[PDB]
Amino acid sequence: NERSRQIDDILEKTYYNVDTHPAESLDWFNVLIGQTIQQLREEAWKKDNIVYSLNAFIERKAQELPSYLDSIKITELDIGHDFPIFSNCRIQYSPNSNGRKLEAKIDIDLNDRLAVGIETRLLLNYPKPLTASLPINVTVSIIRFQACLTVSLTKAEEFVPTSPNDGYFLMFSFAPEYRMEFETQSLIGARSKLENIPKIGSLVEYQIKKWFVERCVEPRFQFIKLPSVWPRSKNTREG
Amino acid sequence: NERSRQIDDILEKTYYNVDTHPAESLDWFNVLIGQTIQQLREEAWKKDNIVYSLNAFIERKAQELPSYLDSIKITELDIGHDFPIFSNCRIQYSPNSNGRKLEAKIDIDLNDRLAVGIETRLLLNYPKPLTASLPINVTVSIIRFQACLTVSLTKAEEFVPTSPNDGYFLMFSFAPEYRMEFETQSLIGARSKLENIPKIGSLVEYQIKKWFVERCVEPRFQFIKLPSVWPRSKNTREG
Ligand SMILES: CCCCCCCCCCCCCCCCCC(=O)OC[C@H](COP(=O)(O)O)OC(=O)CCCCCCCCCCCCCCCCC
Ligand SMILES: CCCCCCCCCCCCCCCCCC(=O)OC[C@H](COP(=O)(O)O)OC(=O)CCCCCCCCCCCCCCCCC
């Protein structure tokens, strides 16, 4: 009926005008997340675990591989050396729930080199039909990711899973107008003028953007189940 | 050896001086958490689930029940109508890891009434030994909780569980100098001058503080295992 009045209670009791209130810097979060990301990156063996799974993804998606190509395979992978900057955090009425729900809008900007080495073979018809050409390693890269991210912690039941719950979730999503800049080149440098190098670059860019839009871009949300932060002794540690 | 230099990389790349940098307001977080807390409170049946578990706790702790008491039992329970305000968020070198780890120090202030109704019986020796007196309902309350909270997201392995892992955790803890103000009274109001009403109040205050210090207060941390926020289709929803 009129939950929203209940909804304001929140705003009034947390000193958030929600219009007048200025945006907030979020820098401490940049730092904590940066710390976990550097931890994540310092496990060297991890990249192999990642490359294995990315090749699993490609195997599952093999039928979507263009006809001129015999095979694609990730051989090397760069996870970068820079961190994602979150900024400009605004609370707004989620657009649009008729004031039922509150969400945070956040700016995100990542300037780094993330790269994949891709061993590539062509599907030729000479001398025999269905001949796999000699391999050629192509490095494909992302060099900037800028986006806007709405976040909230809800119970769901207002949102239905697309392709195959009780509890509380982190709901997040990106506005469809995101910037994701790619860059493409041969591994060798004498191979740089080969015909299919940009073809590969654009394939990969396409797929990555498609994966992304299918999972995180409005009107699609990620719904990630949260644990209780209630103090329990089985979670107690010291040092 | 000198990871810390690796540690600075973070600070330099996230524009955090860590000394000069000012504290940050955190209000959006107050709002999101307030939203989940109001959601948590709008399930009416939930309080019964809570009271059941609190009576389970008391059953487990029954041997610690003072001699003059026959039995204690929670009958009613108030979860409050106000929200916890987080503020003043500083990033600091965790004290002290020799610069290895970074944590956030946060102020927290809750002004609310949280209450429990406790049906209480005395253990008497007249007429017979081990006689349970008539019951009396005592309401015990917390009316302010002010504390300082260090938080970080680590991998552990530097911290060992006290009383009965691989992955990444939310680590949080409170400084030992916390404010937790209690208040105590009879349910009826003609029963207000009964001898054992403050005795009960102080028992409950003691136990609650003890539970708290045993779980969240330095040098003890809560270590809560986090899920991957990596976009996977089994987590994708829409509306
Ligand atoms: C004076 C009475 C005040 C009212 C206290 C309850 C109302 C507020 C607390 C919310 C409901 C508490 C029970 C919810 C948890 C499910 C039941 C359960 O687990 O009990 C078994 C649990 C034992 O499980 P075990 O630890 O695994 O052995 O026992 C308790 O949790 C007893 C809790 C005593 C009352 C808590 C006092 C609340 C202090 C408020 C400030 C604390 C900040 C802590 C930070 C939280 C976020 C970081
Ligand atoms: C051009 C090449 C750029 C390099 C791309 C990888 C380097 C950065 C990504 C980090 C490592 C990626 C794999 C880690 C996940 C484990 C493997 C896996 O799950 O694959 C199976 C997974 C399929 O699992 P399913 O969704 O359950 O079917 O497939 C993928 O995840 C493919 C990912 C394509 C490459 C991602 C492009 C990175 C964009 C960076 C900005 C995206 C922001 C997203 C927000 C994150 C935090 C909120």
Q: Please tell me whether the peptide bond between B125 and the residue prior to it is cis, using omega within 30 degrees of 0.
A: no
Task: Name the residue type at position A39.
Answer: Q
Cβ-based neighbours of A59, under 8 Å, separated by 6 or more: none
Cβ-based neighbours of B204, under 8 Å, separated by 6 or more: B116, B118, B140, B182
Residue entry with tokens 């709002």: B31
Identify the CA nearest to A8 among candidates A104, A99, A96: A99
- CA dist B201 and B182 (Å) reads 8
- CA dist A109 and A147 (Å) reads 7
Residue among A30, A57, A146, A179 whose CB has most ligand 2 atoms within 8 A, to mutate: A57
Answer yes or no: do B231 and A225 touch at CB < 8 A.
no
Q: Six-digit token pair at A51?
A: 């490359």
Answer yes or no: do A162 and B10 touch at CB < 8 A.
no
Closest residue by CA, ligand 2 atom 23? A57
- CA dist B97 and A27 (Å) reads 21
Q: Is B45 annotated as a binding residue?
A: no
- CA dist B152 and B95 (Å) reads 13
Domain locations along chain A: 1-227
Handedness of CA A10, A13, A16, A18 (dihedral sign): positive
Q: Are A139 and A186 in contact (CB under 8 A)?
A: yes
**Triad A37, B32, A27: Cα angle to 5°:** 40
Q: Is B233 annotated as a binding residue?
A: yes
For chain B positions 54-73, those within 8 Å of chain A (CB to CB) are: none
In a 13 Å sphere around the CA of A6, the CA atoms on its Cβ side amount to: 13
Please state the three-class secondary structure of chain A as a single string: CCHHHHHHHHHHHCCCCCCCCCCECCHHHHHHHHHHHHHHHHCCCHHHHHHHHHHHHHHHCHHHCCCCEEEEEEEEEECCCCCCEEEEEEEEECCCCCCCCEEEEEEEEECCCEEEEEEEEEEECCCCCCEECCCEEEEEEEEEEEEEEEEEEECCCCCEECCCCCCCEEEEEECCCCEEEEEEEECCCCCCCCCCHHHHHHHHHHHHHHHHHHHHECCEEEEEECCCCCCCHHHEEEC
Q: Are A16 and B32 in contact (CB under 8 A)?
A: no
Q: How far is B126 from chain A (nearest CA, A)?
A: 40
Q: Six-digit token pair at A181?
A: 């800049």
Q: Please tell me whether the peptide bond between A95 and the residue prior to it is cis, using omega within 30 degrees of 0.
A: no
Q: How far is A127 from chain B (nearest CA, A)?
A: 42
Report the residue of chain A nearest B92, measured CA to CA: A28
Answer yes or no: do B36 and A163 touch at CB < 8 A.
no
> Is there an atom of ligand 1 within 6 Å of B116 CB?
yes
User: Which helix (H) or strand (E) is B3 found in, with range?
Assistant: helix B3-13
Identify the CA nearest to B71 among candidates B128, B140, B127, B135: B135
Answer yes or no: do A14 and B36 touch at CB < 8 A.
no
- CA dist A208 and A215 (Å) reads 11
Distance linking the first and last C-alpha atoms of chain A: 51
- B20 lies within 8 A of chain A by CB: no
Q: Are A88 and A106 in contact (CB under 8 A)?
A: yes
- CA dist B29 and A121 (Å) reads 50
Residue among B37, B142, B173, B222 whose CB has most ligand 1 atoms within 8 A, to mutate: B142
Three-state DSSP at B147 gives strand
Q: Are B150 and B158 in contact (CB under 8 A)?
A: no
Q: Are A218 and A173 in contact (CB under 8 A)?
A: yes
Q: Six-digit token pair at A80?
A: 């970068």
Query: Best interface-test mutation with B: which of A157, A222, A236 has the largest number of B CBs within 10 A?
Result: A236
- CA dist A47 and A80 (Å) reads 11
Q: What are phi and psi of A50, to 5 degrees?
A: -65, -50
Q: Please tell me whether the peptide bond between B161 and the residue prior to it is cis, using omega within 30 degrees of 0.
A: no
- A152 lies within 8 A of chain B by CB: yes
Answer yes or no: do A232 and B215 touch at CB < 8 A.
yes
Q: How far is B191 from chain A (nearest CA, A)?
A: 35
Handedness of CA A12, A15, A21, A23 (dihedral sign): negative
